[PDB]
From a paper:
In order to improve aqueous solubility, ether-linked morpholine groups were added to DATA and catechol diether systems. The addition of an ethoxy morpholine to catechol diether compound 1 significantly reduced potency for RT (WT). Crystal structures for RT (WT) in complex with both 1 and 2 and were determined and analyzed to explain the difference in potency. Additional π-π stacking interactions were observed between Y188 and W229 with compound 1 along with several van der Waals contacts. The crystal structures could not provide an explanation for why compound 1 has reduced affinity for RT (WT). In order to explore this more, we conducted MD for RT (WT) crystal structures in complex with compound 1 and compound 2. Compound 2 maintains stronger contacts with K101 and E138 (observed in >100% of snapshots due to multiple bonds with K101), whereas compound 1 only maintains one strong hydrogen bond with K103. The ethoxy-linked morpholine in compound 1 does not make any strong contacts with E138 or residues in the binding site. The MD simulations for compound 1 helped identify key reasons why the compound was not effective for RT (WT) compared to compound 2.
Reverse transcriptase (RT) from the [name] virus continues to be an attractive drug target for antiretroviral therapy. The drugs that target [name]-1 RT are divided into two classes: nucleoside reverse transcriptase inhibitors (NRTIs) and non-nucleoside reverse transcriptase inhibitors (NNRTIs). NNRTIs significantly inhibit the catalytic function of RT by binding in the non-nucleoside inhibitor binding pocket (NNIBP). The compounds co-crystallized bind the NNIBP causing RT to adopt an “open” conformation commonly observed for RT NNRTI complexes.
Numbering used by the authors:
A (entry chain B): 1 to 428
B (entry chain A): 0 to 548
Amino acid sequence: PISPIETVPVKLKPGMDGPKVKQWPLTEEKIKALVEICTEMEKEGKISKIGPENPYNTPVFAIKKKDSTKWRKLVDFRELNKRTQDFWEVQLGIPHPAGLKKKKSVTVLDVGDAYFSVPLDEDFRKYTAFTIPSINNETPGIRYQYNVLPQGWKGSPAIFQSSMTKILEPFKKQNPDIVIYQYMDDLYVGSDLEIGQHRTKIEELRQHLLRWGLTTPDKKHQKEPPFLWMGYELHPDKWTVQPIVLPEKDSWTVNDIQKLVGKLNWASQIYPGIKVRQLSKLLRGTKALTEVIPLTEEAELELAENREILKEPVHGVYYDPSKDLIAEIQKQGQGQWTYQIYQEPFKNLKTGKYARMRGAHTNDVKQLTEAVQKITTESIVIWGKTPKFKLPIQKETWETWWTEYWQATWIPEWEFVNTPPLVKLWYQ
Amino acid sequence: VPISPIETVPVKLKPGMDGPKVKQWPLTEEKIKALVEICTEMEKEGKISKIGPENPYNTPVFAIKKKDSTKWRKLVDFRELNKRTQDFWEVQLGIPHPAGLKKKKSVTVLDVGDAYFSVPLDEDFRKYTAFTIPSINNETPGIRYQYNVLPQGWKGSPAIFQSSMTKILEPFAAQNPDIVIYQYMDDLYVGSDLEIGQHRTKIEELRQHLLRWGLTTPDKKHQKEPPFLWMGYELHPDKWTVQPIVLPEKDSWTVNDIQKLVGKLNWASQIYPGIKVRQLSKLLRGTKALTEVIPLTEEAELELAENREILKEPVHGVYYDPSKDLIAEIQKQGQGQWTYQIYQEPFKNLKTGKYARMRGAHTNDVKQLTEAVQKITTESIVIWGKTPKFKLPIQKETWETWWTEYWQATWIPEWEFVNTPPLVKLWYQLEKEPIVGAETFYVDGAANRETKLGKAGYVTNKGRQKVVPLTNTTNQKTELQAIYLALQDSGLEVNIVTDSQYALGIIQAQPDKSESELVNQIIEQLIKKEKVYLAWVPAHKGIGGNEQV
Ligand SMILES: N#C/C=C/c1cc(Cl)cc(Oc2ccc(OCCN3CCOCC3)cc2OCCn2ccc(=O)[nH]c2=O)c1
């Protein structure tokens, strides 16, 4: 590579010390892969071994590429990100295209390798320290720090931003209707073109970037994939807040009207315009659960009125940029998961449900992992930043298995919940 | 004169700080004259150097007689400098577990003499280690020194020493890749499959290398021979175990002594199977003064008895063999306590251990089994770098049913069923749809937050009604009460309807055990029933609810 004018100096918030974070234990296999990878990177100049006088540490994991059988090293930069990018979303911050969510199709391209051509400010290198762990604490781990702009660090695309803008300029000129947004190591490219046109334009951008020096190992299965969905493509024009659905039934029992009145009453703390009065009077005196209650004219006059009041969006619900995004996920069974993305309680910026193959293929952790990735990508496309998850999983279980199914180059913040009893029936 | 031409590790003081300025006048002639004998012999060896009143900094100096009172020792309190020095990478946290070591034909322990003092200190930093021996009462220009090497007790000594030793070993470990060297604090643990002759000569080559770098190694033979008492263990050539555990016999037990006891029992549990800490640690629940006298309970003394009986005859752990499968096996002890053994072989264990659920007011057998599996998976990943095949006392369809109907996402590696009782089953299942031809109980309960009296009751579709008074209770407790009442007074199939998300929450969790007797009785009733459908409605929205005060 080359060494452009100086190196962009990186400072921190005054009184902010570098990251010191424990390295999770890894399988022998993953340690091996990390050792190989870093031996290589050491040879190429990207990282160098360090002394005991470097206290800082950032975690490192091993995932596999996207679909590939070759190992990939994923550095978890969340801490260093909070400790730098917070003033580097300010100083060097990249502006977000609110028109990206409008496009009919959006392809994500991996541009990470670019950062590796560029050196990192000397004085800053000590904060990129990571440790390859040893099995059973038999040796002190292997300790490297970065000599070049690291993937996963939010300062990396911010520093490379100008180079990216320049390289992208010609393509942007010939294609004024294509939206291009850089989030960390990925380029999000939107268009209203038909799928064939879209894919061809994306290949045009791939070749453009390629002849300007940017490799994009997003390259597909080429001539003959045996069976796959080859294109990684989103479709944000269809992405909104999923409306609440009341059960559609011919005849109703006491129990059914109870679930109905309960769910409606729950909705009332979101939509204030709901009245359950006429459904309450149609039970009254103590009855059997299985007893069938006939639906009166007034009761259904209340029901049909509460149905179309639930198809409209809420009032006063807007995105607060000074606030963190929060994503809650609830498990629905049968390979289905439902989610909400909000900021303050009961005001939902976006909700959704993402299912997959139901049985004899995938397990719970795989599903939750793909779900978190999907939601995160939607969040990037829509707001230009990732939500903090409340995950329905035991902490240690997730901390053990999340890196098996993780194909993304970024890591969202998460925390773990034991709480919700009733949201299952209500959010499905 | 054991100095060394080892590259020094560059050190800074914490940003915006300076060198310790603490002055020491005191005190006594006896010690003062004794310090010069040490200082001149250290200066000879080049470990320290005199300095001029150029206005450097200063650090306190003490002196003390070693045990048995034969040879003296010098002390320096570096606390100030230590607080003022930069942070270093953490030396080591955990230590390797013997179950994770692999059998080697020969093993040798080498302790390094003079240690830190054999390793030089960064030049520009030496001026902050400056200290002063005073005169006797006379104010005369008492000697001023400073360290050229790693000062004892200084913040940077252990880490810098470790990295120095590593760099020194590197050219030797290259020439001898088939031998394994572990590095721990001041010692080195070497091992090889080399025949005892060439091993015995290799160790000597190592000693010569080390001494060429200024580091002493034990002269007489290789010194220490198995055991090998290391960090509370006993490492034998074919086996490992814990160092002998002694459980004291006393008339009175202070919370401190119960702390020591639970400690020893826990430590023992990694190898001796069956160890139970539940009742003894339950004594320790209340967190208060450590000098308090705590009376033991009956279950605690029974537990302790069972532990004493387990500890009677010694047991041994084996070492790891990468070629052979790693298996872990779990048994329920029944008190909310689980126990497990990890082995590649039937009659010999790599190690053992226990899991006990601490948090939560109510739990589940399958959930606890899962949590245990999680603990062991983590542990195995730590120690052996992989995850074990599991042998579990749970039917496939039981497990499948649980994880499919469980709100949280759980996952298990591949496992096989073991028919060894007690097995793990679901002691009951709530109906997912209301029961036809079953009496419907509308339950409610309420209490007064001041008097704490309250009452619990039901009203049924068959016109049946009951209200029972309660004393010393709470609204949640009155609700669980109400449900219990409906369970007692109904048939084998019953539809209950409640106004409380709390009670519904406890019950839908399907617990088979709890720390409140009420929930336990409810559990018993739930097991006794053929079908129970529990359903919820908004409280005080006037549908089927009880208007009873
Ligand atoms: N004071 C005191 C401390 C003493 C002490 C402390 C540690 Cl932590 C380790 C140690 O010995 C070993 C050293 C290296 C080794 O290297 C193993 C590395 N592998 C690499 C792959 O091949 C197999 C070996 C295996 C060892 O044990 C193997 C098992 N063993 C233990 C004790 C004994 O007497 N004989 C044995 O055979 C000794």
